[PDB]
């Protein structure tokens, strides 16, 4: 038997433990087109049709973006774009309305409601019209059978849409 | 009715989605004492008694460390230290054995098994003895009623102990 | 050395593995009062004030119900009731409107929006009025600092309100 | 305007909220073979070779069992069986030892340690030998690239092996 004394400098009294953390992935799309018909006299949308190129996704992370294009997500080779088509605008007041339309994600189509909030209807620098509005609403991955492989535990069934638009008159 | 054209520069076609991520918290304790009796002739531990000052925890994050001291964790005001006392060393060979002892976390005591791995038994620079060994084992929070408030979902019931020791002879 | 043969009848080649499962807790309250002012001429609510006795919760499970009354939930000893007070009804059409009001959970008050859906405005068996409507909306535990101890991982930050009302005229 | 009174009998003041629950899946295999060489004189295993038919899995649930056979699990069409081959038995005492062997799950092989606990070495009813022992140990899905598609969040990386054997001498 012999007696020893730690050397605290080359000793580590260590432990490892596993925890879960919840976090929001924030994303946008760099490339999309839209057609916008709005009547400032009555604060009503008449047509809103948007096409978004899945390819142009950006979640501030290059390898996740690529991953989004694959089978277990967007399948961007087969379905390069997502579309929204307005079917009904129901005015609440001049700042607010309920927009109903058809969202199409990888060939699957559902009717969704977005909350329109009109934040500013002006004549511009030059005297041609501008508008600023937001569209907000929650959609369910399950409704669109999006990422069906991924559990609703790992990744939320709920996606929150925040469309912020500034826009100028045509011709 | 009027027609508009997005201004892509002040437009954001955005989304937010919630996901879970698993991660290991790695930690050590800066301040502990130990008594170590080991026989290099037979590669057997004779006594191993460790006291660890909960206060000296370090998980590379100052506010989590403080939080560990509180009611829902260590209760370091009431129970400032954790103790390990060896009860039995069962040799497997000269590199390996099973250590049994009593771990005490905030006044609750359980007998645990650690895997002893002896990685090097030498005479030092000066001709006095040194040893290097590790102790590894998994304990369950539930066995010690540690952090009973915190779900075994958020934070793992399993804690992995990695004690890495270098040590020098006495007097 | 000796050779053996399993006895399959008293042998178990076993394993245990831990998984997560997501589930909806559905609940109602057995005891509540309300005041309801509605104009069938215009399909508008004029007053809607509801008080709910926390004590009367029912999630089809007796010990969870009790648990809901405690500090980490409702604190029903201190705050026996939750209240909703309508502040604004904004008509969309005769079947649909947006209701705004003040919800109060254990002394904390936030303004919420419910989606009113009027499903049937009749004169009854006896020739006195009836109405049937629903109120639906999502509130966040965090907005009300409800169950702050419980992680948004274990238990969803989002609660979905489904109020289904059938109701008869007064006097 | 008109005043109404709830009809509590056809009114539901309801809510829905999502929570996580952790649970152990317990399982065994109905069909396996083994070869067992054990020396009661010295309480040492000499050979332990087990083959398990993946097809014979039973987790007390018929549709989960089928699911286990598929690509995201066992791939039982391609890899119908799992094998264990003892490489080393290291005696601790007559009741206890450390078993080392090669586990093979769907063509991927890793060396694992099981804790042998010998609970009873007798001569039987008839005067021929019997033994009862257990083998226990934890393996990691990740080490075997098992169910790589399934997150370590939904389903634990750790599987706990409990082999309980009763067995009788040969010829």
UniProtKB/TrEMBL annotation, chains A, B, C, D:
Alphabetical UniProt keywords: Signal
SMART domains, per the entry: YceI (SM00867)
Domain Lipid/polyisoprenoid-binding YceI-like: 3-168
Chain coiled-coil ranges: none
UniProt-recorded name of the protein: Periplasmic protein
Pfam families, per database record: YceI (PF04264)
SUPFAM superfamilies, alphabetized: YceI-like
Originating organism: Campylobacter jejuni subsp. jejuni serotype O:2 (strain ATCC 700819 / NCTC 11168)
